[PDB]
Structure formats: structure tokens, C-alpha cells
Amino acid sequence: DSEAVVAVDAVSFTLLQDQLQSVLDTLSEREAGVVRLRFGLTDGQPRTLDEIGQVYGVTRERIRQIESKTMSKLRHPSRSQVLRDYL
Amino acid sequence: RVLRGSRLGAVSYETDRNHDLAPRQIARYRTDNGEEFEVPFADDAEIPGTWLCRNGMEGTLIEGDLPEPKKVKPPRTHWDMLLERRSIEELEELLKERLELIRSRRRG
Amino acid sequence: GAMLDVNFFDELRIGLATAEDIRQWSYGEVKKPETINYRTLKPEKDGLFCEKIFGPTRDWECYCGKYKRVRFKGIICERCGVEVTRAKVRRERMGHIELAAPVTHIWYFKGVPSRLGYLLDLAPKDLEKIIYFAAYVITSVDEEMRHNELSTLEAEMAVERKAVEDQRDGELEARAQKLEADLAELEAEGAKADARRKVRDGGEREMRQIRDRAQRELDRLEDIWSTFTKLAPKQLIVDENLYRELVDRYGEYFTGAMGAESIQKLIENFDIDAEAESLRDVIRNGKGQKKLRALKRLKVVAAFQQSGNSPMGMVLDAVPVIPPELRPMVQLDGGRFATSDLNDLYRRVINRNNRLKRLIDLGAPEIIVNNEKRMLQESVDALFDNGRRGRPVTGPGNRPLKSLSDLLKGKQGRFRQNLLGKRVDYSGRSVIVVGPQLKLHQCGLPKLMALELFKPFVMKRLVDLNHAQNIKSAKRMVERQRPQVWDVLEEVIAEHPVLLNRAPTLHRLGIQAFEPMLVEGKAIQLHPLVCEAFNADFDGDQMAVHLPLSAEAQAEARILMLSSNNILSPASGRPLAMPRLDMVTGLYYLTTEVPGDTGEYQPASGDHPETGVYSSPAEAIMAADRGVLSVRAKIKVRLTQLRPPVEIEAELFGHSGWQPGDAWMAETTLGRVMFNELLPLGYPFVNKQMHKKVQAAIINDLAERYPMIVVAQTVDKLKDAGFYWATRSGVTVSMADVLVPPRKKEILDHYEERADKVEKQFQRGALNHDERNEALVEIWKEATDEVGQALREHYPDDNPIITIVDSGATGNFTQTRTLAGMKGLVTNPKGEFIPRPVKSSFREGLTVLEYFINTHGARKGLADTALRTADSGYLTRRLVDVSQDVIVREHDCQTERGIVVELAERAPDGTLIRDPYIETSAYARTLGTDAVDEAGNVIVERGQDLGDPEIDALLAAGITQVKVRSVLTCATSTGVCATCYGRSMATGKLVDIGEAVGIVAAQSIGEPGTQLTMITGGLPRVQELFEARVPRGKAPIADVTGRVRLEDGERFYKITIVPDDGGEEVVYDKISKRQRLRVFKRVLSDGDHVEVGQQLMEGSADPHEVLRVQGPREVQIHLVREVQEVYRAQGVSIHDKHIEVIVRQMLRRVTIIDSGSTEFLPGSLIDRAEFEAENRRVVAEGGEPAAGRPVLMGITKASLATDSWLSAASFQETTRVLTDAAINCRSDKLNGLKENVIIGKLIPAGTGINRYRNIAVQPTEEARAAA
DNA sequence: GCTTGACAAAAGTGTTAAATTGTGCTATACT
DNA sequence: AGCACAATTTAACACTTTTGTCAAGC
DNA sequence: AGCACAATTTAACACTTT
DNA sequence: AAAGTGTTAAATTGTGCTATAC
Ligand SMILES: [Mg+2]
Ligand SMILES: [Zn+2]
Ligand SMILES: [Zn+2]
Secondary structure (H helix, E strand, O other): OOOOOOOOOHHHHHHHHHHHHHHHOOOOHHHHHHHHHHOOOOOOOOOOHHHHHHHHOOOHHHHHHHHHHHHHHHOOHHHHOOOHHHO | OOOOEEOOOEOOOOOOOOOOOOOEEEEEEEOOOOOEEEEEEEOOOOOOOEEEOOOOOEEEEOOOOOOOOOOOOOOOOOHHHHHOOOOHHHHHHHHHHHHHHHHHHHHO | OOOOOOOOOOOEEOOOOOHHHHHHHOOOEOOOOOOOOOOOOOOOOOOOOOHHHHOOOEOOOOOOOOOOOOOOOOOEOOOOOOEOOOOOOOOOOOOEEEEEEEEEOHHHOOOOOOHHHHHHOOOHHHHHHHHOOOOEEEEEEOHHHHHHOHHHHHHHHHHHHHHHHHHHHHHHHHHHHHHHHHHHHOOOOOOOHHHHHHHHHHHHHHHHHHHHHHHHHHHHHHHHHHHHHOOOOOOOEOOOOHHHHHHHOOOOOEEEEOOHHHHHHHHHOOOHHHHHHHHHHHHHHOOOHHHHHHHHHHHHHHHHHHOOOOHHHHEEEEEEOOOOOOOOOEEEOOOEEEOOOOHHHHHHHHHHHHHHHHHHHHOOOHHHHHHHHHHHHHHHHHHHOOOOOOOOOEOOOOOEOOOOHHHOOHHHOHHHHHHOOOOOOOEEEEEEEEOOOOOOOEEEEEHHHHHHHOHHHHHHHHHHOOOOOOHHHHHHHHHOOOOOHHHHHHHHOOOOOEEEEOOOOOOHHHEEEEEEEEEOOOOEEEOOOOHHHHOOOOOOOEEEEEOOOOHHHHHHHHHOOEOOOOOEOOOOOOEOOOOOHHHHHHHHHHOOOOOOOOOOOOOOOOOOOOOOEOOOHHHHHHHHHOOOOOOOOEEEEEEOOOEOOHHHHHHHOOOOOOOOOOOEEEEEEHHHHHHHOOOOOOOEOOOOOOOHHHHHHHHHHHHHHOOHHHHHHHHHHHHHHHHHHHOOOOOOOOOOOOOOOOOHHHHHHHHHHHHHHHHHHHHHOOOOHHHHHHHHHHHHHHHHHHHHHHHHHHOOOOOHHHHHHHOOOOOOHHHHHHHOOOOEOOEOOOOOEOOOOEOOOOOOOOOHHHHHHHHHHHHHHHHHHHHHHHHHHHHHHHHHHHOOOOOEEEOOOOOOOOEEEOOOOOOOOOOOOOOOOOOOOOOOOEEOOOOEOOOOOEOOOOOOOOOHHHHHHHHHOOOOOEEEEOOOOOOOOOOEEHHHHOEOOOOOOEOOOOOOHHHHHHHHHHHHHHHOOOOOOOHHHHHHHHOOOOOOOEOOEOOOOEEEEEOOOOOOOOEEEEEOOOOOOEEEOOOOOOOOEOOOOOOOOOOOEEOOOOEOEOOEOOHHHHHHHHOHHHHHHHHHHHHHHHHHOOOOOOOHHHHHHHHHOOOOEEEEEEOOOOOOOOOOEEEHHHHHHHHHHHHOOOOOOOEEEEEOOOHHHHHHOOOOOHHHHOOOOHHHHHHHHOOOOOEEOOOOOOHHHHHOOOOOOOOOOHHHHOOOOOOOHHHHHOO
16 A cells, blocks of 8 residues: 555654754744745745735835845755755 | 555645634535535635535525526427427327227227 | 544444435435546546545545645535545445335345244245245235125126136037037938048037136136135235236235335334234244244344334345445556456446336336346345355456455454454564573574664664764664664663564463574574474474564563463473473483493492592592593582482481581482582482483472572573583484394294284185284284384393483384384275284385385375364364353352362272372362361361372371362352462462463363374364264263163164163163173173163263253263363373363353243243343242253354354354344443454453553652652 | 835636537348 | 537637746935 | 254145045 | 145255464
């Protein structure tokens, strides 16, 4: 049965979620919310840049440069080394 | 060799939840033999008049909309297959013929 | 009550499903015979896989795809109708099909006995004619109209009869006028005679034809009216033309139909109380075959009357559909599809149902509709139970399709394949090799098998240590076998026990826990002492390794199932981890004494001193390291650290004979000192030659008196010294050691001369064929035994072939007699003896013909071994199943009943010699009464364990009979008590209060059944006794005391016993001449006094007659003795408490003579406790006690007639148990340990009962106090 | 820290042609 | 088999709207 | 294939018409 | 004396089982 639950993957996904929250907690208050709404880590449904700009009161280009700075901050080796093993 | 197989489908890994879920409204349909069925629906959804219920037979909504009989016909109901190949004058001059055979055979 | 069924199970109730229940489970009606699309491979709507009805194929996505996330759940997509939910509810929602014509359930029509036939009083041969459209059945008749209009109807009938007669006499007058015209116009002129005779003959012929055609149609018109005048419901009309004549004429007075709708109409007009009262009254008043039949019908009528059932569930109107994940459609790679063989039957049912629904609306003649309904009935019958009525439905390849009934039956059914025994994770298996340096609790493990076995533990520990970043790199590091993980595996493997198991698992010692230790290689290293328990040999056997995970399972492996906690056997009590084949001959070469050896005790004083003394065993070892001393030479050491025997310590010290440091001189060998240094410090010096029986006695005394950790270390030291001296013993086999007897030739010549005289007397004509066969058999048996004696007396006592036999290491003497000497007689394929016989030996070599003769028995033995080990597992299975609810329940029930033990009969004067079988019937019991000698005192008081010193004290006191408490007379409600059971043979102390002693008692009888070779004598005799059948060599017993008249007669026998009271004599007519009469006291014949239950012929008395005549306390003696005789004839010791545990489960029930008035059908087998309860209540509300006698029934019949319906269906006859559990609406309570195994609960025995698993554990305060 | 203008790709959306599926009919005589 | 015809589903394209990205600027 | 067992028939019976 | 007629035994069919692991 190939559509079954592999037991050593469902543990690894849980530890990946915990490590993801542990890495995202070292960021600031707004950039972590921008990432969690841009990729849908809290609700499951992703958002657009206008959807985050509606809740933060700015345009799409202000949200986009915040995201483009946060993704550069996450490519730091202190933030990339503990996540590189999961891919 | 091993021969893996799959019933076609997927297994997703969202951890389950039970508090925030988009809101739903309940319709109620009524079938022909007086049964009541409750169907949930999304709020942004046009609730239809007729629903194929759990009983196996169609049930309309509890309101009085009366949407459509949709003018559906019989199909061929023999006759039609008789009337399409044989005309009325050939039948009327035959049936009466047969009718007279009821008159002559009864008394000899 | 709980549809989710999560951990709250109080009962589990079965019952018939009405049509209101089938359309209540279901989530919609499947109405198309479609499974899946051919292009898009998506399930079609309203088909056998439809999403709408059974659920979503993908998790949280609808069919069209509008809703695809967990934010919408519980809602139904308004465009496609599929409720968005998990996707594994496709294996739990049902579905139903609405039949356009009713259909009878096949289990309730084609059973044995047929329940629909009993419920309607219709024959099954008539029921099959009705429901498969072959005969109309009258279902109602208006009696009032047929009563009062009968006169006008017969008056109108006489009109048609006289119309037939009038047309008859009109044609007869026409024939009369025609023959008058013939005999007028032909005879008006001159004519020939014979042609006029032919004319008058042909006129008579046509007149006869007229009156006889009229006679035939008159008889037809009489027959239809005679059929109408006797009309009644539940009739049959097989004519199929007479029914149309009854419908067009007198068609208003009745109704008739065909098939399942007519059966439904008969069930509608069925008053259960009238049939119940009539069936009650028939068995009360009448007798004969009519009474014996009505009990069978009263069973099913009372079943439908008592409960809240109704018979309308026997005919169906909606058919449920199993969810599509239990009959999947799996796409194998390569784009291939596999369906699960239930889809074709569902497709055929819905196909023929749709075609019937189309033929009815279209309007059709009756023949096509009846053919369609019969096809629908056969399709649903093929779905429910294939191959029962008619020929089975086949697929491609002429194989029968698998129906729903074939998922539950058999040794493949869901029941014995996937519910009672499963495949497990965290396990492996490998070949086994011998591990002679390990301790008893250890076992080697291959490091690859232990790395793959212990994978999550090492995957955790190498992340607790900084060796990997996370769990994924740890998994990759383990799968790549990086060199750091072997340092971590020894950390995570320490003190973590593993269960080792070897199939077949005959007794409970075939699963044992060991602690592991990593061993290079790929073979499991087993300890050389547990091989007796596993019955493992090292010629290629494989064993399985399981890993217990939780803390409870680790505690159970460390405390309950460790290898060094189970030394003795639960069957007999003998030590099973005793030394064997090599260790026995090592200790036998050690501790023997050779006279005249090197450095013996000389003394020849007068010119030189004794020169055989030694200051200590250290000086003797230093002497034996030179060439001066042999180990098996008699010397006189001075031991300062070994305790002397009681006879020597009594005269040396007496008041305190302690030996840590006090000296005493011992005349022994050196080898017995080096043996006794292995035994414990307080143990007395032995000074005997170590046989195997001596070592069994030594280990048995160590198990009785010393603690359990001393015996294991002693057994390990004994195996070490045994291997070290077996390798020095000098036991080799060469052909120069196989000494032939030097006078074999003259012995064979003398017996050949005797055989030649016998053959000469046969060829002369003196004695016939079978007599000379028997004479040759006797002569060559005497020749065989004489050459055996010559070979026995020729051999030296230190031969390597004869030392292995005499030390009890392995083998016996007869094989040695076949090695050097004579093979003897060889059996036939028939079983008789070949009168030749084989006079060569396996050292001289056989000839061609003697080898070809020997192959007969040598292959018959192998085939019998295979068939015998096939037969023994069935007996072990039945014995486990009949006796699983015999567990220890309380400490003492305080009964005073008890059996008596034979226990050392007198002699002829003679004080008292022991009974031979005391250690199996009187050892490990408890006293019911205080023993008393001849006015004496109480020598052994009530409630003692009856060990060795108590038995010797009872034998010294001169009392030869002891009333003993037992399990046949135990007084608890459910299970036995601890003091009634006695000492558990495996632990050596009293039994605990959770031991499942019924399963131990079944395994102790089932294990040695393979060594039972064989009126019957082998394993069929045990199978005959435990099934309680009537034997083929049935011997009659007496019914009363009196005098026996033995009469011959018409070439069999006659025996008539006349009483002394007197009364009616007893007469037994036909006893065949092969069954010889029976000796006890001359021998039986005539002029004889008979006892009450004396046996009259030799053979085997059936247990039913001895139960009926002598009561239960004698049938217990008979069953225990007749089983233990078969087990004693082959040298197997099973204690009688196991056979008593089995035998107690047979006599638990009574049969009913007279019902009284309390719900008990006559001839039914009810439990004794429930019978006494309903006879306790009956003194209130009118005293009429139900009368019943005790019955004795076999293990299959008792194991099938149990309360639990889930435990009985998993055993035998799953269909006919499941189909009368459902009629009675029988519920289960889950109290045995076969249903808790099925449902996944804890069994109620051992650590699963409440008083053991409700232990609260808290630190004592001083310690919480001191921390 | 944040907004505006401008541009380009991605996603819905409507319509329309094609491909795909469902259903009726074929008359020497045939049992 | 084989063909004819209606009903239905799909895919393809044109056109509009959303969503994202670049350079400038206070 | 067989071994056992329980349900379902030929036939073997006295009893009552004809 | 024939002719059924129902009740009582030997023949007659069907059902269920037949070890364990790789
Ligand atoms: Mg072997
Ligand atoms: Zn949908
Ligand atoms: Zn008791």
C-alpha cells in the first residue's frame, strides 16, 4: 500500500514544523507575520501582497521589499544550516 | 520484486483543526415519501431546489418555489411507433372491420 | 450505542437486520453498475465507487474541485454533492441497493436445518420449488365463502359434468348410428365375413375411443374440484395448468403466488403464539417421531417468540454494499488494474435489478418476469454465499469467485488468518548456531539484525549525542552504516530483552526472553541448555526474534519469561534445563570409579605406608598434573570445604555439623571432588556415579530447597565442566569399536534349523498358512533376543558405543543391537511381519533384498510421522478452545469435597509397597481431610502441599489412602480456586491468582502427542476419549449385581445378567467372536458373580454407559485412567491435574427430562449452575423443579455450545454459529481470553485482572522524606 | 519607512468549435 | 458491424482583470 | 478421501376400509 | 381376502475438518 503513512516521515514533518517556528521566532515581529501570511503557515491558505498590505496599511511594493529583505535574512548560514538537512 | 499500487487519491499533512472553519447553513429537503434530509452548504452558495437525497430518490426544497417540470416527455409509447408508420384512416377502416368481426362471430 | 467504538466496550450484540436498518446505515442508493472511468480514472456518479455516496478520494477535496482546504470541512459542495472530509471514510460508509422484487437470505433457507422450513413447516424440497419459481403456493383462502357457497358451486359443477356426459352420449349415439349405417349398407348386398367382423370391430373401437376420451376429461374435471375442495394455505400446485384453472374459475376464494413475495406473505400471516402453544402441547401430550420433530421447530419458534426479533428480516428488500476501500481497485505499476472480486457480484445484482425494473415498466408476459426474478434471486445468493445452491459462479479460468461468506470461513477466513494471529513490526528471524560460552540468560545477536531491529532507539541516541543534526540525517547515517553507530548500538541494546520463538510452539516454553549481546556474523547464538525446551537442533533450524517496546512488556520479559526463571516444566515438574547429550557423558566420565587405576589407595603396610592419602584436593590436582594420579582413581582426600553426607556428619559432629572449615576424610575419587565443588556450599557430598537420573535428582533437589538464582548458576557450572570432560573422555566411533558377537553364526544356524522344521511341517501339510507365519515369527523373535543377550554380554563396559547408551546420554540399546548383530523382523506396508527376516547387520552391511524389504517400514514410519504431527495440532487446538476459561480466581473456596488417591496398596502381609504412579496423582496436591493413623493423632493436617517428606511420613504411619482436594470438586462460580488446584508444577509453590491453568493443561496434553505411535492404542485413542465418542471395540458393562448366564448360539454370543434383589434381567445379544471374554479373579464365563459396574468383555467401555450407571465420580476415574494409560505406555509423565482440568469442562451440563414450567426445552443441554439457579427460584411462584440428568460430551460439542458468540464463531462452523446467534439475538460480554484477543483489549488473566493492574505505586515517605 | 507610475506576466471569463458519448435503426429466411 | 443524429463535455482562443515587479522619490 | 454426524428418504409394519 | 394409511427403522444425502513456520 503506497498511499499509507510512512511512520518516519510524519515525525520528521512535525520536527520540521517545530524547527521552522524556532527559526522564524528569531526574526522581528512584522517580518515573521509577513512570511507566515505569505506562505500560509498559520491558516493554511496563502495570501497575496495586497492581502498583507490591507492588514498592514501599505501597498504591494512595501510588502514586497519587506519580503525580499526577509528572504535574504533567511539565507544567512545561521538560518540556513539548521534547515538545509530537511531538503 | 514488490509491486506497489495505489487507489488513486492523496494523503495531505495539514494537522487537523476544530475551531475556525468557514461558516455553513443548513437546507432541508423533503422527498416523496415524507422524509426530511438536512444538507450543509457554504454561505456563498446558491442553494438548489431539488437534491438527490440519501434515500435514493429526489427531494425538493421545503419552500414553495416550484422551479421547473422542464417539459420532459414520455418517449415512444408504442402508439407513437404505430402512428408514425400507419395512419388514422388505415386504422379506422381496420378497427371497425375487426369490430364487425365481433358482431358476426358472436352469432355465427 | 457507540458507532465510533473507541475503548468503551461493555457488550457486542448480534441480530437480524430489518430493511429499516439497512436504509439507515446507508449513505445513498447505488443505481448504476459502473466502477470507474476509463480515461480519467475517476469514480463515476451513482456507481460502486461514487464519491458522493462513499466519500472523497483525496483528503479534503470535493469532486469538481471548488473546495480544497481544511477551512471548509463538514460542508457539501453544491455543484458536485461530495462532502469535504477526510478521505479515509471511504472505508467506512456503506451503501444500499433497492431490490424491485424481494429475495430470501440464503443462510436462512439453505442451512442445516433450514430455518425457513422449520418456521413454516414446509419441506426444503418444497421450499426450493416455491422460491425459485417452480410451483405456486396458496397463501390464503376465505373459509366462509368456500363454506357457504359450496352447494351452489357443486351444483354448477354438475352442470359442466353433465355437459361433458351429454357431448359424450351425443358422440356415442353418432357412433351407434354410424355403425348401424355400416352394418346396413355394407350388408345390404352379399359380402365377405371377416371384413364385416373388422367393420363391427372398428365401430366398437371408435365407440371405446369416445367413451374413454370422455372418461379422461371427466377425471380431469373431478380432479380440479377435488383439489379445490381441500384448499388450505402453505400448499403446493406443481401442475402449472391446474392453477390457471383455479384462477379463472373459483378465483375469488383464495390467493396464490410464487417466490419470495409469497414467502413474505406467509410470514405476515404467521401467528407465533399459536404455533408456540401447539408445539408446547405436542411434546407434552404426544410421543413418537412427532414429538422428536416438534422440539426442533420449538427451538426456532421460541427463538423468534422470546426476544424482540421478527422473522420479516429473513426476506430482503434492500441489500447493503460494503465500503469501496474494503473491495479496492488498485492500479499496479505498468498501468494494470486489480479489482477485488466482490465488484463483479455487485455488478451482476444491480444489472439484473435494473433489467427487472425495466421489464416491469415496459409491460411483459409472465414468463420473462419470472425468469428475471429467478435470475435476481440466484445473483443475490451468489453474492452472499457462493457455491451453495447449484454450481458456483466462475470468472475467467474456471475458478469460483470469492463471495462474502468465503471471507469468514476456513483457515483463511478473516477469523483465523487476520484476527487471531497477525504479522508484527519490530521483528526478524535467522538461522541458529550453538553458543557454548554464553550464560543462561544471554543470547548472541547478529549486529545487522540488531541494527535494523533497534533503529529508532539508535536514531534517538545519536541525536542526543551530537552525531547528527536531526532525525533525517540520523536515518541516513543508520541506513548508510556509518562507523559511529556501532558505539551507540551497544549503549541502546544493554539490558533490553528480546523474545525468541521457534515454530512450532508446542508448549509455553517455546517463547523465552533473553538479554542480547552483539555477535559478529549472521547467526543467532543460542545457549546449549535451552535447546531441550525449544526442541531445536542445529542442522539448519531458524528462529524468530521479537522486540518488546513498552515498559510493561519489558517488565514481563524480564520477570515472567526470562530463560533462567523457567527451569522446570509445567507439565510434569522435571527439570528441562538439565544437562544432556555431551554434558552427561562428560560428567559420567568424570565421576565414575575405575578399579585398579593409577595411584589408587594401596595400603600394604608392614614394610611401607599406605600411599593413597592426600592433604587436600589441591595436592591431588598437583599430583594429577604429573603422571601419578588419574581422575577416576579411588583415593582418600581430606576435604575442608565440602559438607559431608548425613551419615558421616552425624557421627563426626552431630549437634552442629557445619563445614566452612572443619576437616573430614573422604574415600572417593578425585573426579567426584571436582564435581562436588560445582554444587553449592551447603549441599552434602554425593559420591555416586552420575547417570542422567542422578543428575535429575540433584537438580530437582536444588529446585526444591535452594533459591532460583542458585540453580541457574549451578546448571551453568555443570554444563562447563561437562563440555570440558566430554572433550577429554575419549569417545570416538570407529569400525574397530563395533564388536560383532563371536557366536552369531551358530545361534542363527540353530534357529534356522527350527524354522526349517516348521517349514517342512507346513510343506508336508500339517499346519496351514497363518499358523506357520506365526511359528516363524516366534522362532525369529527368540533368535533376535538371544543374539541381543550374546551381544550385551560380549561388550566391554568401557566401549565408546556402549558408554553413550549406559550413561543415559542418548539412544537406547535396540539400535546398538541393529548396529552389531541382527536387524530382526521387518514390517509390511500392510502392517504385518515379513517372515523371512533380515539376518544381517548395519556393520556387516545388508544385501539387496534385505535392504529393499527394510525400505517398506522405513518409508511407512516417515509418512506416519508427517500425518501424526498433522493430527496432533488439531487436538491441541480443540483442547485449548474447550478449556480457556479455567483460570485461578480466588485463594480458597473452602469446600470439603475431594477425590481419594490409591497411594501404595498393602502387599500380602507386607506392610506397604508404593504405587508406581504416585508422583503424577498424589504429589503436589492439598489435603481435604486430616490424616489419622491407628488412633494415633493427626499426622499430616489439612491443607499441606503433599511433598516428599509428608508422603514418606504417611507411608511410615501405615495409612494407604488419602482424601485429596482437587479441581473436579472445586466450588467457585467461574474458574477454580488456588488451594483446590494445588502446587503449580513450574514454579514449585502454590499457584497465583491469575494463572490461565486451562491453557497450560491443554498444552501439557498437546505437546507430547507426536511421540505416540500406536480398540485403539495411540493418538486415536486419546482423540476418542476426549471427543467422548462410542468406541468401535465397545465392551458391555453390567447394570446391576447378580449372576451372569453366558450363552452361545448363532455364532456370536449372548449374556444375560440376573440380579440378586431381584427384578428385570439384562440381556446383551450380539457380541462378535473376535471379542474375547474378560479376566479378573479363573476368568469370566458362567456361574459368576458380577459387581455393579463390572466390565464383561475386553476392549473399551464407553463413558456414556458408565456415567449413566455409576455416576460422575466413576466416569472421572474412567476418563483419567484411560487417558493416563495411553500416556504411560510411551514413557510420558503428565500430572493428573491437567487431565482433570480438561475433564471438568466436559461434565458441566445437564439435560432436561421434564420442563416443569421454566423456559427449558426438553433435550436441551443447560449449564449446571443456571439450572440450579432456576430450580432455586422455582420454590417461589409454584414449585415444579426442572428435572435433568448430568451429561458427558466431547470437547468439540462443548466448545461449540458456549455463551460467547464471538469466541465460538472463531473456532468451527462460522456460518451456522453466526446464523443462530443472530436469530436468538445473542449478546456477548467479553469475558474469555479469546475475544479480548480479537477486540484488542487486555485479557482477564495474569497482569490483566483488576487486582494486579490497579496497583498504585508511591515512594514511602521516609524516602520521599529523605530525598 | 514608505508611496506612485508604469509595465508585464498570470489568472479568470465568455464564446465557440471539436471530440466524445448516448441512442435508434437496419425487412428473404432462420425457432 | 455500421451509420446517422442529438446532447454533452472539453480545449482553445480573445479579452479583461489581478497580481507581481522595476525605477524614482520624500 | 475419509471420518463423523445429523437430517431426510424406501420399506416394513399393524390398523382400519372395500 | 385387497387397498390404502399412518407410524416406525435402515438407507441416503450433505455438511465440516484435516500442523507449523520460510
Ligand atoms: Mg532439525
Ligand atoms: Zn465539487
Ligand atoms: Zn477451590
